Amino acid sequence: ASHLVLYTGAKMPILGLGTWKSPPGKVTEAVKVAIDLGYRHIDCAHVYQNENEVGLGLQEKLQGQVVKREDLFIVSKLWCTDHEKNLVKGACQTTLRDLKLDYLDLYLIHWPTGFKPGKDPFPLDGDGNVVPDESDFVETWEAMEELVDEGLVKAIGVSNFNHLQVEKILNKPGLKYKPAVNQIEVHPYLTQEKLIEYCKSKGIVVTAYSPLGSPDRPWAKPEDPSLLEDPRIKAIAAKYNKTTAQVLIRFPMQRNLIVIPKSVTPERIAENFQVFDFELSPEDMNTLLSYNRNWRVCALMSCASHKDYPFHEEY
Ligand SMILES: NC(=O)c1ccc[n+]([C@@H]2O[C@H](COP(=O)([O-])OP(=O)(O)OC[C@H]3O[C@@H](n4cnc5c(N)ncnc54)[C@H](OP(=O)(O)O)[C@@H]3O)[C@@H](O)[C@H]2O)c1
Numbered sequence: 001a002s003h004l005v006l007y008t009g010a011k012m013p014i015l016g017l018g019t020w021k022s023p024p025g026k027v028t029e030a031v032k033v034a035i036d037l038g039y040r041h042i043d044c045a046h047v048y049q050n051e052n053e054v055g056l057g058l059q060e061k062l063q064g065q066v067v068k069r070e071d072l073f074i075v076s077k078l079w080c081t082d083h084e085k086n087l088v089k090g091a092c093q094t095t096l097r098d099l100k101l102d103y104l105d106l107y108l109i110h111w112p113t114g115f116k117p118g119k120d121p122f123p124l125d126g127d128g129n130v131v132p133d134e135s136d137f138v139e140t141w142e143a144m145e146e147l148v149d150e151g152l153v154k155a156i157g158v159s160n161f162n163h164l165q166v167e168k169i170l171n172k173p174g175l176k177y178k179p180a181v182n183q184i185e186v187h188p189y190l191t192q193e194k195l196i197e198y199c200k201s202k203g204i205v206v207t208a209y210s211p212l213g214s215p216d217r218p219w220a221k222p223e224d225p226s227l228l229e230d231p232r233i234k235a236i237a238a239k240y241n242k243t244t245a246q247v248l249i250r251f252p253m254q255r256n257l258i259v260i261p262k263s264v265t266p267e268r269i270a271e272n273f274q275v276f277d278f279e280l281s282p283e284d285m286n287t288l289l290s291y292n293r294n295w296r297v298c299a300l301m302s303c304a305s306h307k308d309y310p311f312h313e314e315y
Contacts (some may be wrong), residue, residue, distance in 0.1 A: 014253055016043050114308070211252055
């Protein structure tokens with residue numbers, strides 16, 4: 001479509017640049033190059049440790065009159081150690097200052113899981129699992145609502161919430177704003193049609209993260225399945241005279257999901273924008289959907305015992 005529309009009215013660009021694992025000394029040029037290629041949406045997060053450097057690229061493009069702030073759709077996320085209601089405004093302000101922006105277009109609760117506050121991002125105990133705080137994400141949701149009320153963010157949403165977690169927000173007494181977006185892992189090996197269908201029935205947009213399976217994820221050990229080099233999808237690419245990457249990016253788009261592929265490589269940032277020039281015929285769509293192995297790349301195993309760990313539920 002080019003954009004999907006959130007329930008607030010705001011047009012959210014269907015393709016965005018992902019910045020997880022984009023190193024601080026590469027992400028400014030990547031952001032700059034992307035905006036030069038026409039990307040108008042950047043997905044960021046406090047925990048990626050490069051929002052300052054994202055802010056540099058953006059500032060350059062905005063002072064250089066290459067883009068108007070209204071044309072940009074910048075997303076960031078509230079980290080797990082900042083879920084306590086009193087910590088939320090502070091975390092949104094750090095992110096705003098680092099990004100050098102006055103408001104965010106979308107701010108997401110990054111994971112349902114609140115971790116014990118402190119500077120350490122993943123506070124681990126002696127057994128090695130993560131330490132929980134004393135908060136419920138419904139209380140965090142309320143402080144996220146105050147950010148809308150003050151004009152710090154134009155829309156709020158969640159990420160990696162299962163449908164019962166989304167339900168607990170939707171059914172909250174006093175709910176002022178509902179999640180405009182649920183950003184979740186989606187790719188052939190985790191097609192997520194139940195959660196997607198659910199959010200779509202509730203009028204929540206879906207952003208598919210890790211559209212290519214994340215080759216650069218630290219935990220990639222040699223025996224892993226590589227979506228990009230899986231001969232089956234490379235074959236349907238060959239037919240399309242498109243790459244495995246461009247077709248794995250076209251797939252969520254054809255499902256009416258926002259896609260945010262990550263690349264710091266200029267050439268691949270341009271290739272990933274070169275997806276608006278074709279359609280996959282319905283057999284192809286069915287051929288990729290049938291690869292649902294329910295293979296998660298972002299499982300957060302360290303937090304599997306957490307009361308709000310999202311993935312013990314089916315969807
Ligand atoms: N909410 C959440 O919990 C959450 C979790 C994970 C990810 N996300 C978001 O989703 C974004 C994308 O997911 P991801 O970074 O995990 O992985 P991804 O987009 O599936 O894959 C990124 C990897 O694939 C490579 N790649 C990108 N374009 C390519 C192309 N055109 N051809 C060949 N290889 C290509 C990248 O290499 P180079 O970068 O070296 O080019 C990088 O190694 C993240 O950056 C982040 O913003 C959100």
